[PDB]
Amino acid sequence: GNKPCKGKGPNCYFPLQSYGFRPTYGVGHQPYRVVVLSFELLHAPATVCGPKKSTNLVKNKCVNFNFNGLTGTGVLTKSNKKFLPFQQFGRDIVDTT
Amino acid sequence: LNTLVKQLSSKFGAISSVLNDILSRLDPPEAEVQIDRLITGRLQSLQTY
C-alpha cells in the first residue's frame, strides 16, 4: 500500500512465510526434498571427470584419443610450442584443435 | 576455401557444432534432431561454394 507501515500490522507484511508440515497432511501439498545439479559442458579440457582408466601415451600412430573429455582421432607427436603454465590446449586458425 | 572451412564451426541452431559431442551426450531420437540442423547448414554452405 501507499502508507508507510513501519512495524508489522495493516497492509505491511513479513516476507518469510512457513507452511504447516504434517505427516497426515493433504496429498499434493506434502513436503518433498529436491536436489538440482547443474553442469557446464564444453569441448575444452575439463576438471571433474568420470571413472575410467588412464592407458598409455602412444605416439606417431593413428589412434583415437581422449584428453580430459576432449576426444578425437589422429596422430600425436611432440611439438616445440611454448605453452604458458595456465594454457592447456592450443588452437590454430579457423578453430581447430 | 577459408570461408568454407570456417563455416564448419557454427551451430545452425543446435546444441553444439561438434558432432561427436552430440552423439556422446544425447539419446539417438534427440541426437538425429540435433544432427539434421548441422546437415542442412553444411549442405547449404557446400551448394553456395
Binding site: 590454430d92 586458425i93 579457423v94 581447430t96 | 576455401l1 577459408n2 568454407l4 572451412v5
Partner: peptide
C-alpha cells in the same frame, strides 16, 4: 626462365594449407 619471368614468378606471392584436412583437396 627469362629474367622477366623470374620477376613475374617472385612478385606473385602464392598453416593455412594444413587446415584443408576436412575433406578438401587441391589437384595439381
Amino acid at each position: 626462365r627469362s629474367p622477366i619471368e623470374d620477376l613475374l614468378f617472385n612478385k606473385v606471392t602464392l598453416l593455412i594449407c594444413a587446415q584443408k584436412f576436412n575433406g578438401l583437396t587441391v589437384l595439381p
